[PDB]
């Protein structure tokens, strides 16, 4: 009898459910967003449930055809519920789901700031593996078997299984994680648990960026020089270089490694010939430059094999090709775009031997496109030098003015 | 009823205006003429189309004024400056004309002798090297010169010769040739050695207001006195009634020219040009002159580059939807910074951007940029002469937001004249005065009409804060062309 894996991606603004098969093909999708920092666990559970059978409905299956359930989630969010380690109020939803279904795992618990990253056990005055059968459901009798934080699930769904394999999620901002196998530490990066599978525990670095895609949104809705994000691709490829124009979208400051919450946005190199193409291209290059800022801070600790990417902006071929160029690393775009749910379904599937082991997953994993660096050493260092100067000239600008 | 006829021979167009004693415009003729760019970076005019443009601009002023030629009491003349012309002994251009923009010449350290003698920092801007080029590279020139069949003149000299037979220039145009000692009020013997200039081609230097000669009846229908002559920026300072020390004329256009009257004081700045304003009734008034390559062109870049406006005028209502610049600045250093920074490697920068930055922010930052860049020049002038007020001309002075912000950031009145063609108006005033069409400059000032007066409305704290942001953004624009 053909069986499938249900996967739940409980996100910040939207709750999703995806039914996968052994090939990582999707068979059914349900998706419902919910009103917004506080979430009402009712409307979240309610939307997360409507999604589930909407997924079972469109996949044309019996509930007893569901071999396992994986869950993944917006991390940190604490249970209305308060919405999302160096300290922050930044620092779960899976448990709220899993027990309305029956616990957290090392990855999700490592974002509590109440869990020891090195001791793997629990001042502030107030935990299983990512792949194991926590409980069962009760109506058909389906087992809950996967749980990880959404970023960590995505890293897993990207099959970034060995050290130095980096997952960059491109969105309004960016989340970049690298697998370190090695509990490593940086002042500029986070240290967290990738996952814990088969009695082992993998560690992950993580850098974040507030404004990446939001700079393209600004091109479209701030100064309205484009109507669609995808238009930046044909504008940037009109040019054979940025021709001196750089754009540092520091709308709310520089993050790591510069750390300056008073930087502001700068466009520099403007001459009478700078047009929409220069601004389009500079905005994409910037997205690639800020990503290099995170990945370089990772190359001081782990060696960086390659970049696996997800998020809507990975549809942009100029951005991906420039991304590889500036990294001198391969940029790998997966067939499956829902890497977060796919990673949770991988975790739950492995618990019931739906997949034999992770290297079968690795063997089965398909890239849609591989972007190979085409850019010499001198060009790469010049461009990134131009970018380093532009960043400098953006610094502390909100010291100067009374905004 | 009599009138004054004013010829404003601009670099791309040739105007002609008939004025009455109250400076009303009774007729106007304007005709562009072709720009000739042979080699790259080279600009050139055929003096015969200039002349034909002018000639028909003239008769299209008389047509529209519907006056007889004999009703023209006097003719004044003003012109794009520096642009160099050579003709034979009966008006025929033996070459073309080498425009003030032409980079042919494009010495300095061997140099400062030029500066004190002429007011001008050495540059291909000025007439000298263009005259040196004409003699050094035309078959027959130099040879036709040392046995004088050739007449040099700037554009006024050319038009004056063609109207009257006489071969003359005024102090202010002369002060732009770079061959003229502005303190001695004479062609400077040394300067003509440094450029192998044979004396025999030079015009006689005369005052800016004085009958130079009369016109042939066959040319215009009467024998009219030609009696005013200044360079065009000086003429517009006169046309603005800037008759007292410290009155400033800012011409807003693609770039800006700013001139302050320092009358009888000859003042010197590292950051400004020293030039002659005019010579009138035996008194020479002097000036300080700053200029800016890119001001209006930054608005054009909004329209043609990133295309966030359709017309320059839209920049006003976009800019006024905001009650401040909210930290957004735009330094439109497209081809570097000038005074007081002098960085040919600066490049344009927009800074302060956030998620909420809109078209309004960019439009306002561009208009402020024009005001700030203007304050940069004016503050260099204020070092050498106290600054009374700003009189403004050029198309962009129709931007009420720009004009008001300009008054606020300078803490000075900004005065917009009713007559927009201040360049032509001034050459009318100069010529009118030589025939007592007006009694004196006091009467002219009595009659002078302002369309609107912008009074400063910004306290000192705000002025210095907003200028301080401007200064901090200028810094972050410097040297960019060498990083890339």
Curated annotation (Swiss-Prot), chain B:
Residues that, per the record, bind sn-glycerol 3-phosphate: 11, 81-82, 125, 232
GO cellular component terms attached to this protein's record: cytosol
InterPro entries: ATPase_NBD, Carb_kinase_FGGY, Carb_kinase_FGGY_CS, FGGY_C, FGGY_N, Glycerol_kin
Keyword rRNA-binding: no
Catalyses which reaction(s): glycerol + ATP = sn-glycerol 3-phosphate + ADP + H(+)
Temperature dependence: Optimum temperature is 80 degrees Celsius.
Keyword Glycoprotein: no
pH dependence remark: Optimum pH is 8.0. It is highly thermosatble.
PROSITE patterns assigned: FGGY_KINASES_1, FGGY_KINASES_2
Positions of glycerol binding: 81-82, 125, 232-233
Record protein name field: Glycerol kinase
Name of the encoding gene: glpK
């Amino acid at each position: 009898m053909e069986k499938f894996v249900l996967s739940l991606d409980e996100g910040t603004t939207s709750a999703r459910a995806i039914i996968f098969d052994r090939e990582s093909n999707i068979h059914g999708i349900g998706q419902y967003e919910f009103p917004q920092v506080e979430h009402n666990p009712e409307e979240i559970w309610d939307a997360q449930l409507r999604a589930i059978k909407d997924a079972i409905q469109s996949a044309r299956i019996e509930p007893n055809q569901i071999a396992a359930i994986g869950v993944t989630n917006q991390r940190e969010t604490t249970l209305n519920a308060i919405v999302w380690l160096v300290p922050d109020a930044y620092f779960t939803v899976d448990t709220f789901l899993i027990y309305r279904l029956t616990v957290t795992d090392y990855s999700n618990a490592s974002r509590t700031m109440l869990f020891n990253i090195k001791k793997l056990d629990w001042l502030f005055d107030i935990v299983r593996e990512s792949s194991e059968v926590y409980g069962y459901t009760k109506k058909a009798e389906i087992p809950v078997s996967g749980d990880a934080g959404d970023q960590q699930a995505a890293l897993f769904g990207q099959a970034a299984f060995e050290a130095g394999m980096v997952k960059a999620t491109y969105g309004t901002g960016s989340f970049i994680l690298v697998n370190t196998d090695m509990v490593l530490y940086s002042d500029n990066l986070l240290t967290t648990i990738a996952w814990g599978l088969n009695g082992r525990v993998s560690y992950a670095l993580e850098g974040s960026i507030f404004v990446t895609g939001a700079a393209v949104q600004w091109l479209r809705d701030g100064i309205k020089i484009i109507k669609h994000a995808s238009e930046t691709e044909e504008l940037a490829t009109k040019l054979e270089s940025n021709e001196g124009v750089y754009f540092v979208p520091a709308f709310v400051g520089l993050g790591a490694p510069y750390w300056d919450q008073f930087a502001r946005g700068i466009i520099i190199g403007i001459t009478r010939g700078t047009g929409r193409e220069h601004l389009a291209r500079a905005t994409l290059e910037a997205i690639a430059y800020l990503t290099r800022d995170v990945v370089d801070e990772m190359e001081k600790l782990v060696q960086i094999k390659e970049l696996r990417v997800d998020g809507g902006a990975t549809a942009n071929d100029f951005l991906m090709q420039f991304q590889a160029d500036i990294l001198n690393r391969k940029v790998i775009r997966p067939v499956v775009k829902e890497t977060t749910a796919l990673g949770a379904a991988y975790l739950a599937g492995l618990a019931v031997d739906y997949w034999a082991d992770t290297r079968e997953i690795a063997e089965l994993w398909k890239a849609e496109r591989i972007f190979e660096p085409k850019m010499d050493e001198k060009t790469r260092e010049r461009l990134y030098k131009g970018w380093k100067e532009a960043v400098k000239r953006a610094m502390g600008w909100a010291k100067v003015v009374d905004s």
